[PDB]
Amino acid sequence: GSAKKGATLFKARCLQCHTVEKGGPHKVGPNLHGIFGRHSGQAEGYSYTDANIKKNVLWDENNMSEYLTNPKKYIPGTKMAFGGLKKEKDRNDLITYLKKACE
Amino acid sequence: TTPLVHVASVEKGRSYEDFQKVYNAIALKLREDDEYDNYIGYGPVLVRLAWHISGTWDKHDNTGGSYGGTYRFKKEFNDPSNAGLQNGFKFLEPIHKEFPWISSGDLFSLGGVTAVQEMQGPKIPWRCGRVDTPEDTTPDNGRLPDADKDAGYVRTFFQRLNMNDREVVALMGAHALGKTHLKNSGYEGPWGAANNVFTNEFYLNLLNEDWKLEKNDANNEQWDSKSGYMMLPTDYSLIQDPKYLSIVKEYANDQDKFFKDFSKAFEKLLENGITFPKDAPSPFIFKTLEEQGL
Ligand code: HEC
Numbered sequence: 314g315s316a317k318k319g320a321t322l323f324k325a326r327c328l329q330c331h332t333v334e335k336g337g338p339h340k341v342g343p344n345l346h347g348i349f350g351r352h353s354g355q356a357e358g359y360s361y362t363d364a365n366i367k368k369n370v371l372w373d374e375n376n377m378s379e380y381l382t383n384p385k386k387y388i389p390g391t392k393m394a395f396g397g398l399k400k401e402k403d404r405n406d407l408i409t410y411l412k413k414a415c416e
Numbered sequence: 417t418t419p420l421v422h423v424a425s426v427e428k429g430r431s432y433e434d435f436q437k438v439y440n441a442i443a444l445k446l447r448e449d450d451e452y453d454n455y456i457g458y459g460p461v462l463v464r465l466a467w468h469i470s471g472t473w474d475k476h477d478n479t480g481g482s483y484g485g486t487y488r489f490k491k492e493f494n495d496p497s498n499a500g501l502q503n504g505f506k507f508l509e510p511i512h513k514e515f516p517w518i519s520s521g522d523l524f525s526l527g528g529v530t531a532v533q534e535m536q537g538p539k540i541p542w543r544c545g546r547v548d549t550p551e552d553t554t555p556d557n558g559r560l561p562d563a564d565k566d567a568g569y570v571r572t573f574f575q576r577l578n579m580n581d582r583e584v585v586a587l588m589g590a591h592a593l594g595k596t597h598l599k600n601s602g603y604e605g606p607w608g609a610a611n612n613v614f615t616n617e618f619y620l621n622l623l624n625e626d627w628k629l630e631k632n633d634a635n636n637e638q639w640d641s642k643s644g645y646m647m648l649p650t651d652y653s654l655i656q657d658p659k660y661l662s663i664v665k666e667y668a669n670d671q672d673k674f675f676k677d678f679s680k681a682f683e684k685l686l687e688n689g690i691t692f693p694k695d696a697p698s699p700f701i702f703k704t705l706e707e708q709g710l
């Protein structure tokens with residue numbers, strides 16, 4: 314999708330816990346800078362739960378779309394609570410802005 | 417003469433299913449107009465509307481309360497402590513046209529029940545029967561709480577709704593949802609990070625953050641944590657009262673518990689002042705969109 318609509322979707326639903334700046338501070342969640350290619354539970358400087366380190370799954374543009382729809386159904390026992398994107402235009406615009414901001 | 421008696425009257429031959437349909441409409445639309453307020457959605461505002469329409473109750477003479485769907489009259493609609501709820505009213509007028517049989521009172525409350533369940537809160541039994549009442553039953557403005565107060569105004573404001581300490585602390589956990597808007601109320605900011613999913617964040621934040629009191633732009637003071645959250649005086653007051661503070665700790669520790677007290681309270685809140693004949697149907701438990709494949 315578009316990168317202009319994905320910039321207002323991340324600064325509204327996320328951002329309060331994650332950050333796209335290189336070397337940012339950890340507020341309530343870990344940093345998403347460099348998330349495409351790393352395993353789940355690899356960010357340093359943050360304590361993860363026992364259900365996020367045991368899954369260990371590579372974050373690609375096909376498996377990350379299922380985690381956005383339901384974060385508690387894909388990974389049972391997660392700590393970050395989030396309703397979940399139920400539209401296909403909101404998941405394609407948020408993944409295009411997370412690939413250009415987190416390089 | 418004793419107070420007024422408000423008997424719940426089921427809508428002419430309607431039943432669960434007729435009511436699961438209303439839920440679905442509301443529920444879906446929350447799924448559809450998700451852009452509201454920087455993507456918080458209509459969740460927080462509908463739960464706040466539910467609370468305000470019910471919070472006018474006065475147990476001494478039984479006036480106000482959800483029963484009459486009087487929020488629809490200007491007097492009430494225009495109460496300044498009701499600023500921002502017009503956004504919640506609009507969101508359901510459509511759905512009302514769809515189901516013109518349901519009363520106003522039954523719609524405003526079903527709506528808050530939907531929003532809680534739809535945001536992953538606990539299940540909230542609910543009952544129908546509210547009946548619409550003439551413009552004359554409209555409560556004067558001023559029966560709702562002030563934010564700028566302390567534990568003791570809170571304890572007392574609530575005895576008028578007939579709620580105890582545990583019920584008042586549980587209800588307040590709803591402050592996990594949404595945020596304050598300066599144009600609506602003089603305060604600004606969210607209580608937490610997951611503004612649209614129902615957890616006990618409210619209580620962990622209260623006790624784990626570092627609050628500093630400060631003035632906003634509206635010129636009011638509030639407690640701000642470094643992390644970007646805010647707490648109103650009335651919320652902070654919950655940890656300054658020794659008695660409020662142990663309920664707050666319970667809850668920060670055990671979500672199930674919170675989840676169970678909240679549901680008991682929220683429903684008690686919504687049914688206050690209403691008499692259900694012994695022939696009315698047991699309270700309903702509605703299914704979520706998730707539970708229905710959606
Ligand atoms: C707090 C309220 C958060 C909000 C809002 C969002 N995220 Fe989150 N995220 C948060 C935490 C505390 C954690 C770690 C949870 C744990 O159980 O340890 C996470 C985790 C993620 C992940 C996994 C990271 C990894 O495996 O390395 C992803 C992919 C992620 N979060 C993304 C994400 C998005 C896209 C959000 C909005 C839509 C979002 N988070 C909101 C904290 C919070």
Ligand code: HEM
Pocket residue numbers: 460461463464467499500561562563564570587588590591593594595596597598600601603648650682
């Ligand atoms: C002492 C009692 C209370 C006071 C003083 C109070 C005050 C406030 C204020 C000032 C706001 C923000 C208004 C705005 O800018 O729109 C607010 C928002 C809200 N209130 Fe409370 N509240 C009280 C109790 C409750 C209770 C008991 C509930 C619910 C069951 C509740 C639910 C909410 C929610 C969900 C929001 C967010 C709304 C949104 O995001 O638009 N409040 N409250």
